[PDB]
Symmetry: D2
Subunit: 387 residues, 4 copies
């Protein structure tokens, strides 16, 4: 009890998350498939704001136009019945065997064209359902061997695909934006644009860079041992955090997709502190898998746990930042000096400033403790409710 989510909290879930049947590389499904209608209803009951989908989550692959219409009709009626939104959608360019060597960067040109047409079709549908963000996860773009993919060529093809997608949404007058979801590996041995940084750098070479941002996932950066709050900070600094995927992950191993808050709890705390202090206004989207040990009821407890954990961490981070003792510790550690310009007086003033070099007392500066440990223990006490 307490920490009750409401749609105002902007919590969203992929249809593929609570709908995961439990198939893993070594195991058959442990749960029956879910009707997306029932997922929308169960999530709304938990306080979710909305759901997201792959084209093939909502409309089974190979569906006829008649079936397509009826699937969308039922989905639309579930959103109307609940008030749930659809802020984001994405294309499945990874499940069908045809994408075994990739979608946009498949060596076979005809597969690349098919991947683009499959995406364009779903962009139209996502706009009709109100999505503001279209996510691209190039899970099959990569290689297990060095000769199989010329990466420069593949980046050329990747740029062509995203440029074409940008040309398309511009030509329809759509307001939707694109977000690249990086992942370093799995299912490919190495995946192109493996981290937030690589995706941010890639975007700066696109024809219309303002149309594209990142959709970073907690577990994906942690799969490379990276600091996810640091990556988010650089995404925010670049103005490119269009969307975020929240979940949990225990270090460098297979993609776990634990519920948010599990995995690296302290990193979750610093992430929530950053998102709230930066004023991130996008969806708080959970891309997690209820473990296959769970039954139907365990699925919903897992989804509820994601939201609850976000709300607990939100309260603790806010109490941390509002605490006068923390505010004094932050001054003691010179976080206020970190926010001041190094040299607003300009280069020439810096060059003539004898206190910056010729008369800098390097030993007195070096002897100044940063007091980071007392600050960090204050953060821990706040996280744990032990103040």
């Amino acid at each position: 009890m307490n920490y009750q989510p409401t749609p105002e909290d902007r919590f969203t879930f992929g249809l593929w998350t609570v709908g995961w049947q439990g198939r893993d590389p070594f195991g058959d499904a442990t749960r029956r498939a879910l009707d997306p209608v029932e997922s929308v209803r169960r999530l709304a009951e938990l306080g979710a704001h909305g759901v997201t989908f792959h084209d093939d989550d909502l409309i089974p692959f190979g569906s006829s136009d008649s079936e397509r219409e009826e699937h969308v009709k039922r989905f639309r009626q579930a959103l109307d019945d609940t008030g749930m939104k659809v802020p984001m959608a994405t294309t499945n360019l990874f499940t069908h065997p045809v994408f075994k060597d990739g979608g946009f960067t498949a060596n076979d040109r005809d597969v690349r064209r098919y991947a683009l047409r499959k995406t364009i079709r779903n962009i139209d549908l996502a706009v009709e359902l109100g999505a503001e963000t279209y996510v691209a996860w190039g899970g099959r773009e990569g290689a297990e061997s060095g000769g199989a993919k010329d990466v420069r060529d593949a980046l050329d093809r990747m740029k062509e695909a995203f440029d074409l997608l940008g040309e398309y949404v511009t030509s329809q007058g759509y307001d939707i934006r694109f977000a690249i979801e990086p992942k370093p590996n799995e299912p490919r041995g190495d995946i192109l644009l493996p981290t937030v940084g690589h995706a941010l750098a890639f975007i700066e070479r696109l024809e219309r860079p303002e149309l594209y941002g990142v959709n970073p996932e907690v577990g994906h950066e942690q799969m490379a041992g990276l600091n996810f709050p640091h990556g988010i900070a650089q995404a925010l600094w670049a103005g490119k955090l269009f969307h975020i995927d929240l979940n949990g992950q225990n270090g460098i191993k297979y993609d776990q997709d634990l519920r948010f808050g599990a995995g690296d709890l302290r990193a979750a705390f610093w992430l929530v502190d950053l998102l709230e202090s930066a004023g991130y206004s996008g969806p708080r989207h959970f891309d997690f898998k209820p473990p296959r040990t769970e039954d139907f009821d365990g699925v919903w407890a897992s989804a509820a746990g994601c939201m609850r954990n976000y709300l607990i961490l939100k309260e603790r981070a806010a109490a941390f930042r509002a605490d006068p003792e923390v505010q004094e510790a932050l001054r003691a550690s010179r976080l206020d000096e970190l926010a001041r310009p190094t040299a607003a007086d300009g280069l020439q003033a810096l060059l003539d400033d004898r206190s910056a070099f010729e008369e800098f007392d390097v030993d007195a500066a070096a002897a100044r403790g940063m007091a980071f440990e007392r600050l960090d223990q204050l953060a821990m006490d706040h996280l744990l409710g032990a103040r």
Copy 2:
């Protein structure tokens, strides 16, 4: 014998590499310090093209102007005696205790100003010695705890420092360029700009982005489990491979700095294949540590091994690419199709192309094997000399 390096091969070494005394976090030095003069002479004898330096490698910290002049004079005479060049230099912003919380992103503003003045001083010296590249390795820019560094503020300070450095070299009319050397961690718990991608993305927000590239290191990207040849390919694609650091590393652990070729041998092969096929013309710089088990003679055998291993891999990669059977396998795997534009016919033609979607035979495409394993075994046979 065979595989004999010559200065034409552009092999360079940091003074700090063969000069490493063997101090590690758990151990005292195992070798005496080297005079940079003797290192220049011993490396030239091995076939090196040149050496690189930290300011504090060449001139001991705190040196007087008179001592500074004599240190440079002796170094200059060693280069003249040997023909060795100095293509690159860098600032030590990590050893002195004053940098314990960083150089350019230290929370203390006066340390940030000192770090800039220390760098500017060394840029002048590096230009005098002929360096074309100035490397920045922010090894102390980062944190061990989440409250200690606001990363957005720190990126603001990092951008200010690099912009100021760019303003300086512009104001002197220097031709030297900057290269960011990323590293994900160590000595800080997490280091800012942790990978090639993060550095590439950062550079695109600098005031004069054309002045800045990356100096990626084999072991640093492998410390995050990333594919180093992939990262190099994205750097080349962006036109930003200004410099490279070659060494070896066994996966995700402390920074090993093994001689090049040790560590991930196959990744070294694919790296050399990429550098040569892309026509990389910069220095082949080794940033390695002769293990502290080695004596003075073991240092030079280790340095010789770096160059020899590059030359062996260069021969094998070239034989791989020139092999008609490999060239046929590459066509079989459709690497030629990967290099063709996905949709040179334009968006509207793609949208009307029924063979791209409505009449695409997705099952026939999916059943087409990529033949990647036969290609990879050809690469292995070439690497091993087992054709």
Copy 3:
């Protein structure tokens, strides 16, 4: 050409390896299922010595006695037709949803009993087919959360299961032995007995420890960042290398199961050097997955590559050890002294030996270089055929 395997080389393959249809967590199958008969025939044609199986690879789960008999009959006729052997078999205690919380350590007692009965049934079949080793891979024994499994209780249950299995084979007079296959994670978040060491230690608490050894897999120890040749050496030292699984893996990430020789090539070289120099006489078993990009022909090229790579590395390691220059380098590095007893003169002689402490010249010893780098470059030259 060259490096042609023959059954004398003892190369074996799981039915599940070349038979893998390509289903991964993000993808549908890319190849049709194989009849085990055709796999036996295709592998024999490649020079394999034999095949191994899970109960459910050879007899589909839930088969009737009549179907069971006919499946075995056809399999037996394929072995007779080819000369192939079945040196090892194992139980599938991981695919069926009933094992979602484990087999022998499932929290539900009735599942643990079922797992034992399922294994006992297959031990009888494996003995009939001539298997000398029965492998246990507890892929589902573990947890994603800390409260879900009391590990001490689970080790009690694991010991009970293995003791019962040992009591069973003793009671039938079977000569078959058990081998634990460790894996640190995946499909569980953490797996019990995660490494060779943990399995070796566990075995020493079993009732009849001599009946049990390890079946270490290259990729599984590398998934924990461990040195696989080191782990094999400790298994050999303990006398417990009953079986081995050969494949490739690129560091710490999901279980890749690349063909042997791919992944960490140098670790493969040192492994083959150790297995041959120790005189390992068991099967050279490949537990690999032909990547799902491959078609049927790519499967067999991948299997052929496993064997070829073993044979190349075998030749190079042997040339390394037989080289008089290497033999001299090994003396220079004091590998001969490593093999001599530290104190065959006994404790009291060591205590009175003033040359061991009071008069030990610690600086002269410390100044002695180990010459490890020249030795390692000799190993690299031999591996690469660059002598």
Copy 4:
């Protein structure tokens, strides 16, 4: 405030922890050396129970007998002044250059003998100071290359060294026991006995195995991506947890030695839950490094944080286990069934039990959810104080 440690809590610290001057591989010291006397006094003031030492922490290397006596005399007076104990001691076989290739497993035989004599000398001193445990950390036992160390030979030498040490303490009638501290890597590329499992397995081949246990360190098992509470559980199961090193670590990277509670907070919670529920009665020893950003006051805040975090986690784990709602959830997840014997009725009864196989309803069992997520969210709510 609250969570105040007392010596009854058995909190101990190495002299090398709070005494760490801040030298890392890239940096000079940031703090002056501490007199062990002042460390004993400052730790006692914080509520510590005792301190531990390397021979060379307490007596500078190469000290004369007169200096040795005076160093011990002053240390003894600090313990008498404070009431602090010395429960454990260890030998520095890693700092001096003579150990660059190892101590007990150095290739040079004379170094191995010296290492044994250096240890034996310190065992006498540790017994005089009251130590119950003597720790061996073979940080230099290992290799950076495959030819440099024959691991079977090295394990022979390691067994000889530990057997000799066991013969020595037996011959003096000492009650002290040995504890192996595993570490997977750093400072060597790979370290022998890399994990708790490998050390446990090694001990079972020693002549007097009952004399030897493990001293596992949180960060060392996490450096291999392993679950530390799982490793502790297997150590407890084997009856070998003689000592423990508590600290924090962020995943797979260099050895961080963060204060306990930092790093993987949830793993710390499950560790404390296990230690308390198993009734571990040994020292709660912190092997951590106050980050080199800290001054003298930051050192003591860091040490205080270790103890405080243990006490908070102890309270929360106890509240978790005592909660009737948690106790009901544990029954719902069948943790009570995990603790029951699988087959106390014996093998033959299991073989005839048709409910264990022929009539086992495998689908009804598989459909039973484990309810692990609701249990884990209860654990999270308890950890966070959000019940």
